[PDB]
Design a protein around this ligand. Structure first.
Ligand code: NTM
Ligand code: NTM
Ligand code: CL
Ligand code: CL
Ligand code: CL
Ligand code: CL
Ligand code: CL
Lengths: 297, 296
C-alpha cells in the first residue's frame, strides 16, 4: 500500500546487481495479485493493528539463496520503510536446513501481507540458483560452464538471469536484439546455415554471433566460415566428441555450446567431450522451488 | 501493437481466462524480448515478405493449457494477420508428436512470437500436466487436489486457470476472498481456537479454514466445530488419526492436507480419508511440458 519504495532500497538492489525498475514491476504486480480482492481479512480479524513481531526466514532444504534484496524490497514497500533488520545472508550463499537467511522486525499485519509475496520470489529465485549450482557441480573437473537461455518464465527474465548468476552459471543473451543466434527455423525459412551466418555477420557486425547446427554437415560449413561460437542442437555424447574433433582440427577459436536433450545425469559426460558450454533451459523453466518459510517469534 | 482484436479478446473470455490479466502478462513478456532491439537475426536471414505455416506439437505427453494465450501473442505481433488451420482445446491430453496448433503468418512475425508463445504454453501445460498427474493418483478416492497461493509472481491467474484445465480445484485467489488462519496468525493470536472464534466474530458469513500443526490443535478446533481444518505437514499416519478424531466428533468438518506433498506419496495421502490435498508444487515447481514450434 505505497507508491514506490525508498531510494535506500533502490541502492540495495543495484548494489546486488538487480534491475531496480524491473524488480519494482515484479513486486508491485505480485502484491496486487494478492490484494486486488480486498484487505487481508484473516489478519484483520485475528491480529491487533498495533502488534509488532520478529520474523525469521529460514530454509528447510539445502541450496543456494537468491532474491533476498527483492524480498526486502517487498517488505519495504508494504511497511513504507518501517522495518528493522537484525540478520541477513547474501544472495549466493549456501544454506542448510534451519539456516537463517533473514531476521526482520515490523508490524505484524504488514508482515502477514508481505510474507507470501516475499516467499514466492525467494523460493523461486533460490530454486533457480540452487539448480544452476547443481549443474555447475556436474561440470567441476572440466572447463565447461553452464548457461541459461530465453526459456524464462513470463515476467521474470532479468530476475531469473540474476538468480542464474548467483548460482554460478552464465547468462545467454537477454532478448532478440542484443545478440545474434541463428536457429533451426531461420535455416528452414532461409537458405543454409552457412548463408545465414554470413548474412547476420554482414547485416549486424557489432553484435556477438552464434549459429545453431543440427548435423555434422552443417557444423562443417560454419567451421569453414570461421564461426565465432557454434551451438550443437541435440547432439549425442558421441556426436559432440566428433564435433570437438572437427573443431580442434580447424579453428580452435570456435566455442562449441551443447543444447537440447541435456539432463543433469548426462551433464558430466558432455562436459568431458571438450565442448565449452552447456545451455540449459531447465535452469529457468523447470527449476524446483527451494523450501523457505517465514516464522514469527 | 497496442491491444488485440476483439476476437481474441472474446476467445479468452470463452476459456475463462482473465483477459485484462492476460494482456499484462503477454505485453510484459514481449517487452522482455524486444527491449534490446528488433530481432537482428530474423531481419538478416528471413525475407521481409516470407509467409510460413507453423506447427506447435509436444515432444512429451501431458495436458495442454494456455493455447488461447499463445494465440493472443500471435495476434498482437501480427496485428491480426494470421490464420489457424487446426487447434486443440486446453484440457486435451496430448502425446508425442500430437499437434496442438497449426497457424500461418508472416515468417518474421512468427519468429518474434515463437519464444513468448512457447514459454507460456510450456509453463501452463506443465502446470496442468502435473495437476493431472496428481488427479490420477487421487483416482478411486473422493479426495480432490487444490492449488495454493504459492504461485510464480505475475502469473497467479494464468496458473490457477491451468490447474483447472489439469483437473484440479482452485483454492482462494488472494488475501481478501477467503479466511485462512495460518501458523503465524496463531502465534500472534495466542491460540488456534482463539483465532477461529475471532474470525467467526468479525465476519460470520465468510467461512474459516483453520490450519493446525498438532493433533491437539485439531481437537481444539473440532471442539469449536470448525467448518474446515487444514492439516499442515501431518504424516500419512497423522492424517489417518486426524480423520478418526473428525469422524468421532459429530461435526462434519472438511479436512484438507497440505505441507510438503510430493507426487511420490500423493496416492497414499489420498487414501488416509482426508477430503482435499493442497499442493503448492502444482504452481511453484511444475516442470515445463516440452512443446516446440516448427516451420513447414
Ligand atoms: O534464444 C536463446 O537466447 C537461447 C539461447 C540458448 C539456448 N536456448 C535459447 C532459446 O531460448 O531458444
Ligand atoms: O494461503 C493460501 O491460499 C493457501 C491455500 C492452500 C494451501 N496453502 C496456502 C498458502 O498459505 O500458501
Ligand atoms: Cl553479477
Ligand atoms: Cl558420470
Ligand atoms: Cl472453469
Ligand atoms: Cl494428542
Ligand atoms: Cl466456521
Amino acid at each position: 500500500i505505497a507508491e514506490a519504495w525508498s531510494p535506500a532500497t533502490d541502492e540495495r538492489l543495484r548494489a546486488a546487481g538487480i534491475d531496480a525498475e524491473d524488480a519494482r514491476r515484479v513486486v508491485v504486480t505480485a502484491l496486487e495479485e494478492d490484494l486486488r480482492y480486498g484487505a487481508d481479512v484473516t489478519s484483520d480479524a485475528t491480529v491487533p493493528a498495533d502488534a509488532v513481531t520478529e520474523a525469521v526466514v529460514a530454509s528447510r532444504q539445502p541450496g543456494v539463496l537468491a532474491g533476498l534484496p527483492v524480498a526486502l524490497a517487498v517488505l519495504d514497500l508494504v511497511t513504507g520503510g518501517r522495518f528493522e533488520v537484525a540478520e541477513c545472508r547474501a544472495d549466493g550463499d549456501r544454506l542448510g536446513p534451519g539456516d537463517v537467511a533473514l531476521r526482520v522486525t515490523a508490524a505484524t499485519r504488514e508482515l502477514l501481507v508481505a510474507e507470501r509475496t516475499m516467499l514466492n520470489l525467494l523460493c523461486h529465485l533460490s530454486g533457480v540458483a540452487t539448480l544452476t549450482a547443481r549443474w555447475n557441480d556436474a561440470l567441476a573437473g572440466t572447463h565447461c560452464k553452464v548457461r541459461d537461455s530465453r526459456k524464462t518464465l513470463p515476467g521474470l527474465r532479468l530476475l531469473e538471469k540474476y538468480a542464474v548468476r548467483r548460482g554460478g552459471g552464465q547468462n545467454h543473451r537477454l532478448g532478440l536484439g542484443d545478440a545474434i543466434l541463428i536457429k533451426d527455423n531461420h535455416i528452414v525459412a532461409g537458405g543454409s546455415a552457412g548463408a545465414a551466418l554470413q548474412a547476420a555477420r554482414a547485416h549486424t557486425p557489432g553484435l556477438p554471433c552464434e549459429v545453431e547446427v543440427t548435423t555434422l554437415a552443417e557444423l562443417d560449413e560454419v567451421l569453414a566460415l570461421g564461426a565465432d561460437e557454434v551451438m550443437l542442437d541435440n547432439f549425442t555424447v558421441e556426436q559432440c566428441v566428433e564435433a570437438v574433433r572437427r573443431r580442434d582440427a580447424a579453428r580452435t577459436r570456435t566455442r562449441l555450446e551443447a543444447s537440447g536433450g541435456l539432463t543433469l545425469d548426462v551433464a558430466a559426460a558432455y562436459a568431458r567431450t571438450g565442448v565449452d558450454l552447456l545451455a540449459v533451459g531447465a535452469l529457468t523453466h523447470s527449476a524446483p522451488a527451494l523450501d523457505l518459510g517465514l516464522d514469527f517469534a
